[PDB]
């Protein structure tokens, strides 16, 4: 079997400006490379075949290229909804075997979080179980750590991370950091705290709460 | 234009047999065989083979030839793959895309996926939560809402905030597995003149359980 190789894995380059996928074979496959992009949440969709033909429709800023054993495949005037997963497969000799993948990160300008501490719901509460639900919004670049905190006691255990992937209209991310908890360990304690360390500054953000009227 | 839409995603416990059907479209069925691709989670790419729509003879891929079975149904010109005895690690999502010439080495046009999760997990609804704030305006004069959609199994949920109109400003954060169910979750922001004047809603569909909620996320403060 031919194996193609995508090293590297990730890729960041900002908007309008170029980047360069590299795919390589392990022997003279002879131009027989397919570049498919795979858009986060959809199919792949073909670009280009026999190293450098589009297929109906992929505009002109992508250029496919190579030969022997390297190929590339380059994007220019990148558009924030560039961002995608980036293969090869080969198109030579049977079975028809793909890359690892490269995905096209947008770099962005700074973005600080948007952090938003939410208290368990009263029906949640009903049913015993408590759950602080804190919100990072729209936030470049990707890393962003966030700690629990109840009562100045860092809680470091029963909390679920997940991160939305980068937005295709902004080019920013977002987390939703949920803390799980007892209702009777809840009531055992008052002060809840979301507090995040990003880039952004220097003095974490940091959000905190408990019922009172507004 | 051509199209292929291929079956809803199936929950199959270890052990048994999934036909999955691939119903093509838009183009003549007996003159372009089929591809069947695996996308795993972890993994990427993998050609599982291609089938002649006109002789009907199938080239299996070595990782395959045996626990899979491709056919077609060529008077409904649909393509079917099925997996017999499924072995967890066959989770997935399995792709159907046209050989452009014979034997497939170009799938042009490719089809939705179909997701296979092979889990001994029992069906759960979900318990829908409306996520009011402790007042707290987030940023210049929005607020922002949420919906905790939680415990259920397996995916997927269909969360829209107010049937669909509440477009913009959301954010519905990835499903993550604590283990046995599964919890998700969305955000949405909204100016002031908005809440709690006009009615925000989350309405959550689990049609697993065949679960349909609508929550108002109404002031609690």
């Known amino acids: 079997d031919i194996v193609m190789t995508q090293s590297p894995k990730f890729m960041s380059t900002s908007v309008g400006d170029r980047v360069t996928i590299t795919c390589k074979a392990s022997?003279?496959?002879?131009?027989?490379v397919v570049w498919y992009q795979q858009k986060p949440g959809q199919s792949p969709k073909l670009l280009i075949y026999?190293?450098?033909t589009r297929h109906i429709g992929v505009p002109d800023r992508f250029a496919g290229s190579g030969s022997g054993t390297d190929y590339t495949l380059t994007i220019s005037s990148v558009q924030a909804e560039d961002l995608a997963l980036y293969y090869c497969?080969?198109?030579?000799?049977?079975?028809?075997?793909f890359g690892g993948g490269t995905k096209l990160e947008i770099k962005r300008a700074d973005a600080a979080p948007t952090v938003s501490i939410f208290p368990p719901s009263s029906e949640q509460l009903t049913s015993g179980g408590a759950s602080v639900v804190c919100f990072l919004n729209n936030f470049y670049p990707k890393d962003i750590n966030v700690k629990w905190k109840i009562d100045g006691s860092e809680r470091q255990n029963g909390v679920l991370n997940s991160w939305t992937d980068q937005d295709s209209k902004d080019s920013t991310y977002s987390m939703s950091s949920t803390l799980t908890l007892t209702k009777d360990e809840y009531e055992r304690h008052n002060s809840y705290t979301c507090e995040a360390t990003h880039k952004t500054s220097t003095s974490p953000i940091v959000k905190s709460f408990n019922r009172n009227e507004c | 234009q051509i199209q292929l839409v291929q079956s809803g995603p199936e929950l199959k416990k270890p052990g048994e047999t999934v036909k999955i059907s691939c119903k093509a479209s838009?183009?003549?069925?007996?003159?372009?065989?089929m591809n069947w691709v695996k996308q795993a989670p972890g993994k990427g790419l993998e050609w599982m083979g291609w089938?002649?729509?006109?002789?009907?003879?199938?080239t299996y891929g070595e990782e395959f030839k045996g626990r899979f079975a491709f056919s077609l149904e060529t008077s409904a010109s649909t393509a079917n793959l099925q997996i017999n005895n499924l072995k967890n690690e066959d989770k997935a999502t399995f792709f159907c895309?046209?050989?452009?010439?014979?034997?497939?080495?170009?799938?042009?046009?490719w089809g939705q996926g179909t997701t296979l999760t092979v889990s001994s997990a029992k069906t759960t609804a979900p318990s829908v939560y409306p996520l009011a704030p402790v007042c707290g305006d987030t940023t210049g004069s929005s607020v922002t809402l949420g919906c905790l959609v939680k415990g259920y199994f397996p995916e997927p949920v269909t969360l829209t905030w107010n049937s669909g109109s509440l477009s913009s400003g959301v954010h519905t954060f990835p499903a993550v597995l604590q283990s046995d169910l599964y919890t998700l979750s969305s955000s949405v922001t909204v100016t002031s003149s908005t809440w709690p004047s006009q009615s925000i809603t989350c309405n959550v569909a689990h049609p697993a359980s065949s679960t349909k909620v609508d929550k108002k996320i109404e002031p609690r403060g």
């Open positions: 895309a046209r050989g452009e010439d014979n034997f497939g080495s170009l799938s042009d046009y």
């Open positions: 838009g183009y003549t069925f007996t003159n372009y065989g």
């Open positions: 089938i002649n729509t006109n002789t009907g003879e199938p």
């Open positions: 022997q003279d496959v002879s131009t027989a």
């Open positions: 026999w190293a450098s």
């Open positions: 497969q080969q198109h030579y000799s049977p079975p028809w075997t």
